[PDB]
CSV table of C-alpha atoms in Angstrom, one decimal:
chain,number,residue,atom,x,y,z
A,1,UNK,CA,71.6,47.4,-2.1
A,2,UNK,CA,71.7,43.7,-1.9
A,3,UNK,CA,68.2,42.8,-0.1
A,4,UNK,CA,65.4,44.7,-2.7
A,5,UNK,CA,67.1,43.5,-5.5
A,6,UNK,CA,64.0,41.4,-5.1
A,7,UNK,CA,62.0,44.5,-5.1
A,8,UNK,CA,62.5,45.6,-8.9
A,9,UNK,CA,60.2,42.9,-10.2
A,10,UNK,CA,56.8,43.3,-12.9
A,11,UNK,CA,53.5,44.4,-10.5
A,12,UNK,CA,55.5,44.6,-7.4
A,13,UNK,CA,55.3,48.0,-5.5
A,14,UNK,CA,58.4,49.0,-3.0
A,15,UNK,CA,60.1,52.2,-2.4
A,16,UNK,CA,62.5,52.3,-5.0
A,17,UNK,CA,59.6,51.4,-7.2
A,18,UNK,CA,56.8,54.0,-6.0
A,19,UNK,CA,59.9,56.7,-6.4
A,20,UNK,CA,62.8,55.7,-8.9
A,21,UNK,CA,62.4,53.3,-11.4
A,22,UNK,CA,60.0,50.9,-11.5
A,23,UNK,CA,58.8,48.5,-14.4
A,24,UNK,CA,55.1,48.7,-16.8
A,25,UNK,CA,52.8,46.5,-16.1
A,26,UNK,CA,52.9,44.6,-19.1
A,27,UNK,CA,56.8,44.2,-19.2
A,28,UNK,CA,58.7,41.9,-21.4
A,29,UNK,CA,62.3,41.8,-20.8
A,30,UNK,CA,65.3,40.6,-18.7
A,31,UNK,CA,67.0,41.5,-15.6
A,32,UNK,CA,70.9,40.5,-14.7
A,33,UNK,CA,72.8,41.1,-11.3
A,34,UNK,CA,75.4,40.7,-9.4
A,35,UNK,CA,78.0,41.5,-7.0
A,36,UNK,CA,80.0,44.6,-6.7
A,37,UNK,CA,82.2,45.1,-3.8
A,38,UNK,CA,85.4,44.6,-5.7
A,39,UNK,CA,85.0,47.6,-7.6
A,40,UNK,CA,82.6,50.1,-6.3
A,41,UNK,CA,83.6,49.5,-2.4
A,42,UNK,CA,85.6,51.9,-0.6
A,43,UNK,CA,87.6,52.1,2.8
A,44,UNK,CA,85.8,54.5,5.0
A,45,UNK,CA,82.7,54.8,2.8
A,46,UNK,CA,81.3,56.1,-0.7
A,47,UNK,CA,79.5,59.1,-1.6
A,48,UNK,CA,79.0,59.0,-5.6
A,49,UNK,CA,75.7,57.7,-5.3
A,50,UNK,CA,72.8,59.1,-3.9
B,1,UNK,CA,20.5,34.7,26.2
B,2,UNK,CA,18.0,35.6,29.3
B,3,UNK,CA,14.7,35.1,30.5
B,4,UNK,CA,12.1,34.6,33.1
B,5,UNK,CA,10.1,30.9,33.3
B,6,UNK,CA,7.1,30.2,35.3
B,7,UNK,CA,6.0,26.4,34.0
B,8,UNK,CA,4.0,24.1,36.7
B,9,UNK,CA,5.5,20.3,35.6
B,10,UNK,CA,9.5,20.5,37.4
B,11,UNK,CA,12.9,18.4,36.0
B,12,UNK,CA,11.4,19.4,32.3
B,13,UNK,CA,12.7,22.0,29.6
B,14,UNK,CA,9.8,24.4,28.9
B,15,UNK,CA,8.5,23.6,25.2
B,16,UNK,CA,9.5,26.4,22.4
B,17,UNK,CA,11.2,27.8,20.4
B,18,UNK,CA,14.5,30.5,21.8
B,19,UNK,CA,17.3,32.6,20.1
B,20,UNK,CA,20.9,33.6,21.2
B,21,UNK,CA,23.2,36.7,20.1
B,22,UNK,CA,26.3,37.5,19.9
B,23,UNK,CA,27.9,39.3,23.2
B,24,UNK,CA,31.9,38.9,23.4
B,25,UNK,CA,35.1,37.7,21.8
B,26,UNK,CA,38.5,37.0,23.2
B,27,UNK,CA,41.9,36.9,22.1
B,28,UNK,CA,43.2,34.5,24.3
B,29,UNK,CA,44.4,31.7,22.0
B,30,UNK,CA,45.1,28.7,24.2
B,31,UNK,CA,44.3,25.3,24.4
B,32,UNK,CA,42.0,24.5,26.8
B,33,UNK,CA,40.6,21.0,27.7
B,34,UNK,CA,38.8,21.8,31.2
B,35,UNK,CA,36.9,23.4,32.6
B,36,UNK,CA,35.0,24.3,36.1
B,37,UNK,CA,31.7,26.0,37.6
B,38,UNK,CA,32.2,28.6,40.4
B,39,UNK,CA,29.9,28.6,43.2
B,40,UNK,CA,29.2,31.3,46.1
B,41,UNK,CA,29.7,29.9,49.6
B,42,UNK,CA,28.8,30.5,53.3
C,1,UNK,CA,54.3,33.5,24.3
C,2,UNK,CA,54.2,36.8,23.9
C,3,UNK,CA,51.2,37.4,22.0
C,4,UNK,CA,50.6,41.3,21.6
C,5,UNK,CA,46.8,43.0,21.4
C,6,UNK,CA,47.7,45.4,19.8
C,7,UNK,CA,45.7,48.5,19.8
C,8,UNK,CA,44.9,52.0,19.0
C,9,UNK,CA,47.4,52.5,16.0
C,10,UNK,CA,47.7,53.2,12.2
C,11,UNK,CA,48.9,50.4,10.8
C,12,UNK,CA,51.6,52.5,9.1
C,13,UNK,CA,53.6,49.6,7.6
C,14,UNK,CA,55.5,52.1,5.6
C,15,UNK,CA,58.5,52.5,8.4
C,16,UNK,CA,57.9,49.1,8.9
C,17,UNK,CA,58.8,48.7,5.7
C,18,UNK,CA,61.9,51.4,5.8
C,19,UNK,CA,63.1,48.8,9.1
C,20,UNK,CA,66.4,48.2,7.9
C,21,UNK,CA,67.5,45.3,9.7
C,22,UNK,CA,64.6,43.2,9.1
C,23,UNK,CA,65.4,41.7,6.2
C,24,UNK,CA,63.0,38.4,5.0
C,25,UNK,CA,59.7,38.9,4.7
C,26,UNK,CA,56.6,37.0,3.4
C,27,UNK,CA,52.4,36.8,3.4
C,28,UNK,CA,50.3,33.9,3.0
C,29,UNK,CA,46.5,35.0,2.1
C,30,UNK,CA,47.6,38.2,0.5
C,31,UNK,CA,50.4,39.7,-1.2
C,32,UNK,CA,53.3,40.8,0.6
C,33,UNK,CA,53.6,44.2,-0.7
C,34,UNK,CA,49.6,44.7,0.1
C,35,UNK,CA,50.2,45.1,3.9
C,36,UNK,CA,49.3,48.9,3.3
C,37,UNK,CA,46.4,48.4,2.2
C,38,UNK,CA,44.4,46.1,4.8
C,39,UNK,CA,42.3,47.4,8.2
C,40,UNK,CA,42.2,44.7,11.0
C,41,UNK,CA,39.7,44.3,13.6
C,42,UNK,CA,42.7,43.0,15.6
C,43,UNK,CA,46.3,42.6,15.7
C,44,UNK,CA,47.7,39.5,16.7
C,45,UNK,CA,51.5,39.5,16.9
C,46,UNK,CA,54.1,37.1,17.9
C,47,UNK,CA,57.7,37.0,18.4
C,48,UNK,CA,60.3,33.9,18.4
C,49,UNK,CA,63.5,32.4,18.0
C,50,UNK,CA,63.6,30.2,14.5
């Protein structure tokens, strides 16, 4: 989801980070996003990701 | 800070040396300019 | 103003956190993720319009 895209970042702590996926302290890399509504949207809702 | 005085000059501060605590904080957070004494009458 | 005292609490920012509709959020003095891990001898909130 759009508004914790600013949560995946080096040394920062949020719930996607403390659970799923979050980076090493000494990270050196890149990060790339974007929108996705075009193609992953769906009338009445989603379910393929959880 | 409290205490009891007996001194024989009058219209003078007794001499010394005294100390003050700490007793109570407030929340309030306003701006206040004024202020007023409050006196019991008969 | 509708300062609050407020009182007698855990300051479980966690669901705070998990608040879905609030959606900026900053800190001045600390970092904002460290929320979690501060005690207060008070609280001392405010709501508004901006």
């Amino acid at each position: 989801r759009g508004d914790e895209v600013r949560q995946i970042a080096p040394g920062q702590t949020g719930n996607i980070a403390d659970y799923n996926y979050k980076l090493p302290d000494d990270f050196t890399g890149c990060v790339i996003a974007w929108n996705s509504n075009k193609l992953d949207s769906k009338v009445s809702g989603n379910y393929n990701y959880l | 800070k409290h205490t009891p005085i007996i001194v024989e000059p009058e219209r003078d501060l007794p001499q010394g040396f005294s100390a003050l605590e700490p007793l109570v904080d407030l929340p309030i957070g306003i701006n206040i300019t004024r202020f007023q004494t409050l006196l019991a009458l008969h | 103003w509708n300062r609050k005292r407020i009182s007698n609490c855990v300051a479980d920012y966690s669901v705070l956190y998990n608040l879905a509709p609030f959606f900026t959020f900053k800190c001045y003095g600390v970092s904002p993720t460290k929320l979690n891990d501060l005690c207060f001898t008070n609280v001392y909130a405010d709501s508004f319009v901006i």
